[PDB]
Write a protein that binds this DNA or RNA. Structure first.
Ligand SMILES: CN[C@@H]1[C@@H](O[C@H]2O[C@H](CO)[C@@H](N)[C@H](O)[C@H]2O)O[C@H]2C[C@@H](N)[C@@H](O[C@H]3[C@H](O)[C@@H](O)[C@H](N)C[C@@H]3N)O[C@@H]2[C@@H]1O
Ligand SMILES: [K+]
Ligand SMILES: [K+]
Ligand SMILES: [K+]
Ligand SMILES: [K+]
Ligand SMILES: [K+]
Ligand SMILES: [K+]
Ligand SMILES: [K+]
Ligand SMILES: [Mg+2]
Ligand SMILES: [Mg+2]
Ligand SMILES: [Mg+2]
Ligand SMILES: [Mg+2]
Ligand SMILES: [Mg+2]
Ligand SMILES: [Mg+2]
Ligand SMILES: [Mg+2]
Ligand SMILES: [Mg+2]
Ligand SMILES: [Mg+2]
Ligand SMILES: [Mg+2]
Ligand SMILES: [Mg+2]
Ligand SMILES: [Mg+2]
Ligand SMILES: [Mg+2]
Ligand SMILES: [Mg+2]
Ligand SMILES: [Mg+2]
Ligand SMILES: [Mg+2]
Lengths: 103, 117, 88, 64, 47
RNA sequence: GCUUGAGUCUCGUAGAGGGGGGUAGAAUUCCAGGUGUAGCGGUGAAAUGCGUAGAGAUCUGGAGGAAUACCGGUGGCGAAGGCGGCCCCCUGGACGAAGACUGACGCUCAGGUGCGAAAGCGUGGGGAGCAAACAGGAUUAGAUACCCUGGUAGUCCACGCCGUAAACGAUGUCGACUUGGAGGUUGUGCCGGCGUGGCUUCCGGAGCUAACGCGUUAAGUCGACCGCCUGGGGAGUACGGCCGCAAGGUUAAAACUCAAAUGAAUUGACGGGGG
């Protein structure tokens, strides 16, 4: 199991689906013996530039420990979920539990 | 014919020529002038003076619309960068903001080969 | 590279101890483990020439260690190449 | 170098207020020779800014 | 004229016209490396 | 036998090292539409070209390819060739600390084998930009050029081939030893200093060198092994062999001919070099 930092940006219209998305994704992680070391719903932020004409998006940050397989699966989920406008999965060396600079 | 008040002067300052196009803020053109169409060919076309005259003739082209405010968008390396803006201020437009909009690739396409003059 | 756990398993199987990491048998077993592991990599990544240079060093090092072991102790050599399923 | 002076481990792409000090008005990454950042931290900073730009936490350019 | 002098200075700061002049023609990587080395040796001779 | 060479293990560090996949933003081009109207473009000057069938400019939307500004650095990594957005996956090497382990397991290497820029070649894709060829416009005594407007191969991808470059540090690899000074980069010990490693620059001492220069990253002082040279031209050519789809590569002469060819530095003179 490896440590990953996941940021996903949701379409501001589907801001109300984000609690549902989080509980779905975190269940997919913990289902396969993973751990959510950090979750932060940053909410709707102004984008620094437009993405698909959107000037805002709803950011979620997740630091996760998980098998590679379920993270690959969560990446496919992001790709095909139309609500998720952008995502970034990054490997981290260790688990990050502390508050982000956003909170 | 219709009134606008606040438009945008687009200065296309190339090495060879200066095109001045005054648009509204939706980017719909109202009028335009060029150094090359202002009585300047060859060496003289690519000068700040010829660009000034182009700026003046463009102001004449948009006087019907009754523009008072211009945002100035400057595009390119040419001699008519500064002289065009001075001439627009001198025509009695209020210059509200000057942006450089010169396109820069973040790498982009391979440019033409160097000239062996 | 070989994981900490896979390394330690090979050291246990082939050494005289957990400390016996230097033994020719351990070294050859470790090189053999990674040579065998990397066959899957190079099956997929046929044009990874840079990594393959590291593989060919492992192969050459193993050959030199086996040739050392053969001339020092033929019976240890015979046992080792049997356990690891090497031709020579 | 602020980052050495604070014993910073890795620069965070998320720490936008920090990163804003090392970009110009245009959005361009400021050279280490201007800012006095150490080479090791300049490289982390460049990566962090590029990650922040991808997530649209920083602008690539002043004229998007 | 203050705001125009301010625009001028902002363009010099951003290095727009240096960037345009650089990108007018293709420089071979050999030529780029040769001038980078020339700039390094000159900057060293400054010291 | 031994542990000092050479390896293994443990923890960690930096990195455009490699392979695969994904993705982002800027820009160019094109397509469609809006505004708009006589120019645009180009040059030393022009013209070809483009434009009233509405260009250029400007705005909106779309398509597509290629490359990744800034960071960026006598910065880094790699055996060399080379490698630069970001993210993931697979993967190679280097280095440091402290300790354990093996016990000369080493160095070099003809033949052999592998890798090997760009161009080129084959098959299948792709094609924005650039651009051999080519076309037109100039320039010119001419101008099969330089300049301009276009533009095909190609440049891109997959797989296979080619096997060469001023593939250069024009400097083979390995080891040891021999005053200094100033930097960069990357570890690390101890208390901002003081050390101690790796890599990498500049200057310079002895010494060496024809000189230029090199100078602990030696071209110094030595040792091991390999490669290569033997006047210029003819010629890296011919012929033969081998290799290659080809282009060609590789190995490699002779006749004949000349009394030089050459290196470095010196004084002039000269320059459409500078001051
Ligand atoms: C300190 N090492 C340098 C070497 O570096 C090369 O080999 C090293 C390995 O040993 C590498 N680490 C390095 O990356 C690589 O570049 O290149 C040579 C090239 C040679 N013409 C001469 O240059 C001189 C010039 O010839 C002269 O004209 C100039 N004025 C001064 C130069 N030093 O001396 C240098 C010098 O010996
Ligand atoms: K999506
Ligand atoms: K041998
Ligand atoms: K073409
Ligand atoms: K001399
Ligand atoms: K040797
Ligand atoms: K040799
Ligand atoms: K002769
Ligand atoms: Mg041109
Ligand atoms: Mg790696
Ligand atoms: Mg190196
Ligand atoms: Mg050979
Ligand atoms: Mg090629
Ligand atoms: Mg082809
Ligand atoms: Mg062309
Ligand atoms: Mg041409
Ligand atoms: Mg050769
Ligand atoms: Mg080279
Ligand atoms: Mg070189
Ligand atoms: Mg050579
Ligand atoms: Mg020296
Ligand atoms: Mg010599
Ligand atoms: Mg031949
Ligand atoms: Mg032959």
């Amino acid at each position: 199991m490896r440590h990953y930092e996941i940021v996903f940006m949701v379409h501001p219209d589907q801001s109300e689906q984000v609690p549902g998305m989080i509980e779905r994704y975190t269940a997919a992680i913990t289902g396969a013996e993973g751990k959510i070391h950090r979750l932060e719903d940053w909410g709707r932020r102004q984008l620094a530039y437009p993405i698909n004409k959107l000037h805002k998006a709803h950011y979620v940050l997740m630091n996760v420990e998980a098998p590679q397989e379920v993270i690959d699966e969560l990446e496919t989920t992001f790709r095909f979920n139309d609500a998720v406008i952008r995502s970034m999965v990054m490997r981290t060396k260790h688990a990050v539990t502390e508050a982000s600079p956003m909170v | 014919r219709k009134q606008v008040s606040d438009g945008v002067a687009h200065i296309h300052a190339s090495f060879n020529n200066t095109i001045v196009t005054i648009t509204d803020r939706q980017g719909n053109a109202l009028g335009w002038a060029t150094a090359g169409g202002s009585g300047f060919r060859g060496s003289r076309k690519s000068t700040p003076f010829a660009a000034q005259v182009a700026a003046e003739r463009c102001a004449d082209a948009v006087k019907e619309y009754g523009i008072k405010n211009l945002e100035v968008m400057v595009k390119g390396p040419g001699p008519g960068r500064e002289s065009t803006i001075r001439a627009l201020n001198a025509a009695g437009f209020r210059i509200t903001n000057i942006t450089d909009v010169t396109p820069i690739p973040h790498x982009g396409c391979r440019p033409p080969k160097k000239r062996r003059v | 590279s070989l994981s900490t756990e896979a390394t330690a398993k090979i050291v246990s199987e082939f050494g005289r101890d957990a400390n016996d990491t230097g033994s020719t048998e351990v070294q050859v077993a470790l090189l053999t483990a990674q040579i065998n592991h990397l066959q899957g990599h190079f099956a997929e990544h046929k044009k990874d020439h840079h990594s393959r240079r590291g593989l060919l060093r492992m192969v050459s090092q193993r050959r030199k260690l086996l040739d050392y072991l053969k001339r020092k102790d033929v019976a240890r050599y015979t046992q080792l190449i049997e356990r690891l399923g090497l031709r020579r | 170098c602020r980052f050495t002076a604070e014993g910073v481990q890795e620069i965070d792409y998320k720490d936008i207020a920090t990163l804003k000090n090392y970009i110009t008005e245009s959005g361009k990454i400021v050279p280490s020779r201007i800012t006095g950042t150490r080479a090791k931290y300049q490289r982390q900073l460049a990566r962090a800014i590029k990650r922040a730009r991808y997530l649209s936490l920083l602008p690539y350019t002043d004229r998007h | 004229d203050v705001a125009l002098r301010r625009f001028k200075r902002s363009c010099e700061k951003a290095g727009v016209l240096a960037e345009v002049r650089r990108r007018e023609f293709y420089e071979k990587p050999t030529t780029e490396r040769k001038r980078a080395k020339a700039s390094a040796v000159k900057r060293h001779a400054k010291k």
